[model samples]
Target: SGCSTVDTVKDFNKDNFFTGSWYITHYKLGDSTLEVGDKNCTKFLHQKTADGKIKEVFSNYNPNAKTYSYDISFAKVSDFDGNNGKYTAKNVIVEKDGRKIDERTLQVSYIDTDYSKYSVVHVCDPAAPDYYLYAVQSRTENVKEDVKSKVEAALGKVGLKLSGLFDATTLGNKCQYDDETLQKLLKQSFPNYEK
Candidate 1:
């Protein structure tokens, strides 16, 4: 499941992980580094609904992303350890003009965090038993170098050593989009895209 981990977060807050944007500083997807970005803007926004479900949208800035691809998942605290940031997404859909995907069950754990400052998120899918996605996310683009150091240290706590990281932050273009605008732009671009 988790590629390698001697790690776990004993304390984490759901409120802290939610309520705003989290930028991806580095991430690992299975054996490959997720080389995200032609535009290099990587971040996600969380929309907490009135009914209390968190709808999250991963909005990456890819200049060539005319018919942009993103994943929108609705999730909620799934257990007694909500403080641990354990969550489950019943419907996790990855949208692309290309092909259909597993729509897998996502397991998210808050590995570490100081809230709004930095967070280490570990994700895996029951459907994809061979994979795990780990990330060092931030509230802003520029965080101190020590923050990364802390992540690696935390990895050590989990019995993990830094082998590699897929750096997605090229900072190429800084484009901002509200939900409606991004959705509309994508829809227009994919006017005749396959279902």
Candidate 2:
């Protein structure tokens, strides 16, 4: 197995790790790729404030319509972070048809590096056989390609392969450089950051 050694609580910074908004770039859904255009596709926006609390909003944006067609009911992120104060998903909702069609407990975990790359996992509800094990990655757009490859490599440890990732660029009809590259481009366009 290629899984990296499990990280300890001391290795994580609750203040830094839980703070800020995370944009979902890719996820694995069963044996197929759950790209942005798919009916079941979803994007996650997470925010954890200085008060040591968290909140999340899920949106399913439609490219054709240029709108979010589905959304998750606002919920406290703490509700999913289990009794041990670790990330856990109990009674989590799986939305479909503009409503939550089912509920399942997800065993969730995450890893983040100071470089702004992060990965998260959500183990499916054992009772819902078709539910997929999901791994999500978030980072500045300039670092997306390299970060995505790193995420895929990390997923391979658990016998998961990413064969069907949707290209968000195509779906959104825009081009974005990876984080570092984007920063360089911005600096070139506006010489003020260095000064």
Question: Which residue pairs clash within candidate 2?
Answer: 33-164, 141-178, 141-179, 142-177, 142-178, 142-179, 143-178, 143-179
lDDT of each: 0.57, 0.44
Listed per model in order, the count of residue pairs whose N, CA or C atoms clash below 3 Å is 2, 8
**76-172: candidate 1 lDDT, tens digit per residue:** 5543154555666643445433133435667676677777677777777776746777777877774556676777775555445445655555443
Most TM-score-accurate candidate: 1
lDDT of candidate 1? 0.57
Candidate 2 versus truth, CA RMSD in Å, comes to 11.4
TM-score of every candidate relative to the true structure? 0.69, 0.55
Predicted candidate 2 versus true structure: per-residue lDDT over 148-181, tens digit per residue: 5676665565555555544343444443223332
- The total of clashing pairs for model 2 equals 8
